[PDB]
Amino acid sequence: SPFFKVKKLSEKAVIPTRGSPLSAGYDLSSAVDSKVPARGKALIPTDLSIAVPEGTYARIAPRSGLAWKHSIDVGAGVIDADYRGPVGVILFNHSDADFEVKFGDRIAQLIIEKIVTPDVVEVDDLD
Amino acid sequence: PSPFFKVKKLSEKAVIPTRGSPLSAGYDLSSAVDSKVPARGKALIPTDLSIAVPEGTYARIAPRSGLAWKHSIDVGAGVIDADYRGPVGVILFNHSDADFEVKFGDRIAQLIIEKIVTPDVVEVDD
Amino acid sequence: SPFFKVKKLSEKAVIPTRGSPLSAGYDLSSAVDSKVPARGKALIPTDLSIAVPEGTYARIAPRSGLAWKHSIDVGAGVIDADYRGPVGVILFNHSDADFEVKFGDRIAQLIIEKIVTPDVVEVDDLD
Ligand SMILES: [Mg+2]
């Protein structure tokens, strides 16, 4: 049984929702207004904590709009299934234009990616 | 299901994406146009393809390794839903101080069909 | 049955390890002293070769601390299940300060992502 458990850390938090029926990702909204300086970065809180199943992780993935319109990309974004701290989104601004994130703007989408995690076998030949 | 990958050409410039080694993750994507990705800038490179991938996956537009080292090229955005039937364009960021030229038919990215889970969003206090 | 095979290519390589039971990734360490120049890139050798199962790839993925503290991002990062050459991490530096890497520094994390690789078919009409 897959699951996506979400805890609001604030009254500011928006519960993530999927944008199309067969959408890969749950949209993540900013819990703050924040500058993202030209050629710099910002750490935007979501005011959520999450849990996802073992055998998956939550990837905070970029939105196509912020990227193509504002040259905004998402850094880091690997949220382990046992990570219970608050979810923040790191944004990089790859343009000479200051940008600003507004409270409640969708800044990323969370994608619950299937993975495997076997124990490493060291070999002298990989075959 | 049975997984599948259907592509529809939107012009005769589109190239059928193909894999590159039998256990290969990704299907090479070719540019449909002559264009460029400016130094320290960005471009949308059309593929002239529309695609379908199975429910419980998405198509990730992912960077080629050769272009990353040689041109400082990275893919922006790149999340194509199993739902999406519009044209597929590749957002490229150029993290160097020289323009990156693209000719029609060059490989500018690779598409990976990643398995995902899509449950309902269950709010808690944990 | 998933596996993760690793071959050391020198005594400078470190076997990737997972932080917690539910960690998505295996930490990767630099086999070299190097640097990522301000606004530039580097290829950092791992001195590893690897093999992962058919139906997966190894994604080279970013550490969040490095993203936030140093504006470090991972470029490239798609390692095919049948790629048997040396694993190098490409790093982009989205700040104006050079980033030093010391031999044994953790520079990325490896995630073994589940995928499908069906036979592509061109069609006249989409579903
Ligand atoms: Mg992925």
Curated annotation (Swiss-Prot), chain B:
UniProt source species: Arabidopsis thaliana
Protein name: Deoxyuridine 5'-triphosphate nucleotidohydrolase
Swiss-Prot/TrEMBL catalytic activity: dUTP + H2O = dUMP + diphosphate + H(+)
UniProt cofactor(s): Mg(2+)
Pathway: Pyrimidine metabolism; dUMP biosynthesis; dUMP from dCTP (dUTP route): step 2/2
Keyword Metal-binding assigned: yes
Cofactor binding comment, as recorded: Binds 1 Mg(2+) per trimer.
EC number assigned by the record: 3.6.1.23
Record-level GO BP terms: DNA repair; dUMP biosynthetic process; dUTP catabolic process
Lineage, highest ranks first: Eukaryota, Viridiplantae, Streptophyta, Embryophyta, Tracheophyta
The family this protein is said to belong to: Belongs to the dUTPase family.
Span of the entire protein shown here: 25 to 150 of 166
Other remarks on this protein: Silencing of DUT leads to high seedling mortality and affects plant growth and flower organ morphology in surviving plants.
GO molecular function (one): identical protein binding
Keywords: Hydrolase, Magnesium, Metal-binding, Nucleotide metabolism
Residues noted as binding Mg(2+) in the record, renumbered to the chain: E114
Free-text function comment from the UniProt entry: This enzyme is involved in nucleotide metabolism: it produces dUMP, the immediate precursor of thymidine nucleotides and it decreases the intracellular concentration of dUTP, preventing uracil incorporation into DNA.
Assembly with partners or alone: Homotrimer.
